[PDB]
Amino acid sequence: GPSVFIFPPNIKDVLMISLTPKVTCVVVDVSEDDPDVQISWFVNNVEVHTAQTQTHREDYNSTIRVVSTLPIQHQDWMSGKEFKCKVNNKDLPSPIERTISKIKGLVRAPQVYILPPPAEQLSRKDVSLTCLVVGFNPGDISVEWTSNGHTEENYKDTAPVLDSDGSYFIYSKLNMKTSKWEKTDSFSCNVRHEGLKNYYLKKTISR
Amino acid sequence: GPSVFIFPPNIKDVLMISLTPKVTCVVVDVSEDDPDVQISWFVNNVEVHTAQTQTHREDYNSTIRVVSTLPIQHQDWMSGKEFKCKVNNKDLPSPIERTISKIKGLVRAPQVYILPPPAEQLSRKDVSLTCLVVGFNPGDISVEWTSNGHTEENYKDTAPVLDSDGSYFIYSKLNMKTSKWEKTDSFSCNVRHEGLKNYYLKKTIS
Ligand SMILES: *[C@@H]1O[C@H](CO[C@@H]2O[C@@H](C)[C@@H](O)[C@@H](O)[C@@H]2O)[C@@H](O[C@@H]2O[C@H](CO)[C@@H](O[C@@H]3O[C@H](CO[C@H]4O[C@H](CO)[C@@H](O)[C@H](O)[C@@H]4O[C@@H]4O[C@H](CO)[C@@H](O[C@@H]5O[C@H](CO)[C@H](O)[C@H](O)[C@H]5O)[C@H](O)[C@H]4NC(C)=O)[C@@H](O)[C@H](O[C@H]4O[C@H](CO)[C@@H](O)[C@H](O)[C@@H]4O[C@@H]4O[C@H](CO)[C@@H](O)[C@H](O)[C@H]4NC(C)=O)[C@@H]3O)[C@H](O)[C@H]2NC(C)=O)[C@H](O)[C@H]1NC(C)=O
Numbered sequence: 001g002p003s004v005f006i007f008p009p010n011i012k013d014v015l016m017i018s019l020t021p022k023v024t025c026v027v028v029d030v031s032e033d034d035p036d037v038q039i040s041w042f043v044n045n046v047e048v049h050t051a052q053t054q055t056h057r058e059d060y061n062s063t064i065r066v067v068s069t070l071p072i073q074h075q076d077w078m079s080g081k082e083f084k085c086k087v088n089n090k091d092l093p094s095p096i097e098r099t100i101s102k103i104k105g106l107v108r109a110p111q112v113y114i115l116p117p118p119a120e121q122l123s124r125k126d127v128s129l130t131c132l133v134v135g136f137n138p139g140d141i142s143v144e145w146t147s148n149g150h151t152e153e154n155y156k157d158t159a160p161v162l163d164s165d166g167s168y169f170i171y172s173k174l175n176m177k178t179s180k181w182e183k184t185d186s187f188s189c190n191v192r193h194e195g196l197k198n199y200y201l202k203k204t205i206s207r
Numbered sequence: 208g209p210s211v212f213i214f215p216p217n218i219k220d221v222l223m224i225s226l227t228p229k230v231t232c233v234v235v236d237v238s239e240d241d242p243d244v245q246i247s248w249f250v251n252n253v254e255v256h257t258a259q260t261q262t263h264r265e266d267y268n269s270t271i272r273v274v275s276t277l278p279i280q281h282q283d284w285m286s287g288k289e290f291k292c293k294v295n296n297k298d299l300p301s302p303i304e305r306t307i308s309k310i311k312g313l314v315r316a317p318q319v320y321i322l323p324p325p326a327e328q329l330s331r332k333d334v335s336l337t338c339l340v341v342g343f344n345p346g347d348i349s350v351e352w353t354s355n356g357h358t359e360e361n362y363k364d365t366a367p368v369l370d371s372d373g374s375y376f377i378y379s380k381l382n383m384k385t386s387k388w389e390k391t392d393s394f395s396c397n398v399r400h401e402g403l404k405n406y407y408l409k410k411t412i413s
């Protein structure tokens with residue numbers, strides 16, 4: 001039968017008032033013979049009808065995939081409301097329910113550091129610039145890169161990792177040809193985390 | 208009913224001839240009223256009786272957990288033999304089978320770099336020393352820390368991450384007092400990966 005997964009809003013959406021946070025319920029392994037899936041959503045056990053639901057055939061493994069996206073209020077996520085999807089399909093004996101909420105806990109702001117490329121890397125044609133964000137709880141965080149107020153897209157973050165001291169760290173790695181690294185006036189590590197004043201810190205490394 | 212998960216040997220065991228690599232089959236959500244589970248193992252579809260199997264009650268969630276550990280030959284893993292567990296329990300309509308093997312692929316050796324603690328951290332009482340291992344395939348790697356032949360245990364690695372160029376990177380973070388950093392003669396990042404000459408490279412910093 002079908003499996004249902006529920007996913008939280010993206011922390012960047014949660015932490016910026018101009019963006020819309022969304023809870024996601026994904027149904028996989030739906031049969032092509034029984035494609036109809038009914039998804040109901042609840043906020044604190046009250047039914048809401050604000051979700052958008054898309055259905056798609058996964059041609060690569062002969063199943064249907066349904067995705068429902070519930071837009072939510074920042075205040076409801078932050079205050080700990082429970083967001084619940086309920087899924088009905090012919091292949092299902094009883095409806096499947098999933099619920100999710102922000103779990104209350106310890107809050108601690110990250111320290112943000114930028115580490116330049118290692119000397120041994122500078123003779124190469126490409127270099128990596130590292131942002132180390134350490135000491136934060138909880139381990140939901142957004143790290144993005146810019147260059148002089150221009151968006152940089154060639155970077156990868158690690159997952160947040162539980163450190164020995166009970167907090168989290170994450171490393172972000174921006175990749176660039178060595179000539180950009182010399183040519184450029186500054187680079188910035190843009191960190192969004194609920195532990196931070198104004199939910200935002202920027203750290204810059206200037207030529 | 209019960210569910211079964213299968214796990215590969217540790218990459219360090221695979222890459223050191225003196226260590227025994229092990230395939231692990233774990234059965235969870237076994238009922239307390241039917242604890243008996245039969246696990247059989249197969250290497251390329253021929254049955255072996257070399258595994259050690261342990262059962263334990265999980266008191267925190269009222270279920271039985273069974274762990275079968277199959278010791279394997281390095282060459283068997285490396286040459287791509289399939290290792291298979293078959294699990295029987297009274298709560299299974301039919302036996303559950305899981306199989307694993309080393310997947311064949313490109314091999315690329317990592318570059319290893321060590322980055323000193325960031326300048327703004329030197330003012331604090333604890334510092335972070337970073338090993339950046341980058342440019343490797345496949346994404347199975349061992350990274351460990353020493354100082355002067357001494358084992359350092361206060362470090363955490365990230366999992367390997369698939370990079371922009373199709374290769375993997377990992378970061379390893381060694382935590383220590385600022386004094387230790389300033390007084391210690393050397394720190395070494397010890398990397399084990401199948402792309403490396405002798406499956407081993409050590410980078411060292413002062
Ligand atoms: C047929 O194919 C489909 C599709 O697969 C795709 O196509 C095929 C052909 C292949 O190419 C394949 O590689 C392709 O992916 C298959 O569908 C897959 O099915 C499996 C289940 O069989 C699903 O596995 C679960 O994955 C969860 C994690 O999923 C995320 O991360 C994975 C890993 O990368 C991604 O692949 C997924 O897409 C998910 O990614 C997330 O997606 C979110 C929703 O979109 C994103 O959030 C949204 O993002 C947007 C922006 O994009 C907005 O911001 C929204 O606001 C936001 O909501 C999110 O960003 C994104 N993240 C990432 C990383 O990109 C696992 O969590 C889950 O594990 C749980 O469940 C298991 C039970 O099955 C259980 O064993 C685990 O232990 C775990 O259980 C949970 O554990 C905790 C305790 O720790 C408990 O609290 C829970 O209750 C507990 N649950 C239970 C009940 O025990 C699964 O591993 C897989 O996700 C799914 N893929 C896709 C793409 O949907 C299908 O299987 C194929 N069928 C056949 C027959 O072969």
Ligand SMILES: *[C@@H]1O[C@H](CO[C@@H]2O[C@@H](C)[C@@H](O)[C@@H](O)[C@@H]2O)[C@@H](O[C@@H]2O[C@H](CO)[C@@H](O[C@@H]3O[C@H](CO[C@H]4O[C@H](CO)[C@@H](O)[C@H](O)[C@@H]4O[C@@H]4O[C@H](CO)[C@@H](O[C@@H]5O[C@H](CO)[C@H](O)[C@H](O)[C@H]5O)[C@H](O)[C@H]4NC(C)=O)[C@@H](O)[C@H](O[C@H]4O[C@H](CO)[C@@H](O)[C@H](O)[C@@H]4O[C@@H]4O[C@H](CO)[C@@H](O)[C@H](O)[C@H]4NC(C)=O)[C@@H]3O)[C@H](O)[C@H]2NC(C)=O)[C@H](O)[C@H]1NC(C)=O
Pocket residue numbers: 210212214215216217228229230231233235236265267268270272
């Ligand atoms: C009752 O409790 C038990 C026990 O849980 C514990 O106690 C409870 C009370 C809680 O406190 C809890 O927090 C505790 O953990 C519960 O048991 C759990 O059940 C879930 C599913 O219900 C299992 O989830 C799967 O996890 C896999 C990953 O497992 C590792 O990682 C987690 C977290 O990091 C660890 O907790 C686990 O222990 C696993 O850790 C690994 O264990 C290995 C073997 O022991 C180690 O390797 C060995 O290492 C030793 C050294 O020690 C030697 O070196 C050996 O040589 C070596 O072999 C290994 O190092 C270690 N790693 C780490 C990081 O520690 C997931 O892979 C898996 O996902 C798959 O399956 C899902 C199906 O359910 C599916 O949805 C997913 O999509 C995914 O599916 C597969 O995807 C792959 C690609 O990855 C595809 O190729 C496949 O096709 C596809 N298959 C399928 C079928 O679709 C699950 O998420 C969980 O592992 C298990 N925990 C334990 C401890 O056993 C139980 O659920 C509870 N019951 C109830 C009702 O509450």
